[PDB]
Amino acid sequence: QQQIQTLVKEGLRGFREARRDFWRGAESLEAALTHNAEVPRRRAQEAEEAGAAL
Amino acid sequence: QQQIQTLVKEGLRGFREARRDFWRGAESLEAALTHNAEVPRRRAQEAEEAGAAL
């Protein structure tokens, strides 16, 4: 109950916190790499706006 | 015929060359100051294009 129960119950919990927050970061970065890429060549205000999001 | 005829005939001729070329420069600069001023605030490719003409 000290070691193995605690580990199963609440010993993976901050690894799983960090991992879901971390893949959330890459979800948003995957989306903003797309966003960064949808910039027309003529544009400059869209370029700095897209690039700030990236 | 040496001095006063020559001066009347062809003695003002390079002053008048320089002056009409010079007011021509300011005609085009008056027009390009207008041109420089017709730039929408959103724009950056129009800004550098207008500004190069100025």
UniProtKB/Swiss-Prot annotation, chains A, B:
Record annotation: effect of changing residue 24 to Q: In a colorectal cancer sample; somatic mutation
Compartments in which it is found: Recycling endosome membrane
Tissue: Highest level in lung and spleen. Low level in heart, kidney, liver and pancreas.
Superkingdom classification of source: Eukaryota
Domain notes: PH domain binds phospholipids including phosphatidic acid, phosphatidylinositol 3-phosphate, phosphatidylinositol 3,5-bisphosphate (PIP2) and phosphatidylinositol 3,4,5-trisphosphate (PIP3). May mediate ACAP1-binding to PIP2 or PIP3 containing membranes. Only one PH domain of one ACAP1 dimer inserts into the membrane, while the other PH domain acts primaryly to interact with adjacent ACAP1 dimers. The BAR domain mediates homodimerization, it can neither bind membrane nor impart curvature, but instead requires the neighboring PH domain to achieve these functions.
The protein's role, per its UniProt record: GTPase-activating protein (GAP) for ADP ribosylation factor 6 (ARF6) required for clathrin-dependent export of proteins from recycling endosomes to trans-Golgi network and cell surface. Required for regulated export of ITGB1 from recycling endosomes to the cell surface and ITGB1-dependent cell migration.
Note: Cells overexpressing ACAP1 show an accumulation of ITGB1 in recycling endosomes and inhibition of stimulation-dependent cell migration. Cells with reduced levels of ACAP1 or AKT1 and AKT2 show inhibition of stimulation-dependent cell migration. Cells overexpressing ACAP1 and PIP5K1C show formation of tubular structures derived from endosomal membranes.
Assembly with partners or alone: Banana-shaped homodimer laterally assembling into tetramers, the tetramers further pack helically onto the membrane. Interacts with GTP-bound ARF6. Interacts with third cytoplasmic loop of SLC2A4/GLUT4. Interacts with CLTC. Interacts with GULP1. Forms a complex with GDP-bound ARF6 and GULP1. Interacts with ITGB1; required for ITGB1 recycling.
Protein name listed in UniProt: Arf-GAP with coiled-coil, ANK repeat and PH domain-containing protein 1
Native organism taxonomy: Eukaryota, Metazoa, Chordata, Craniata, Vertebrata
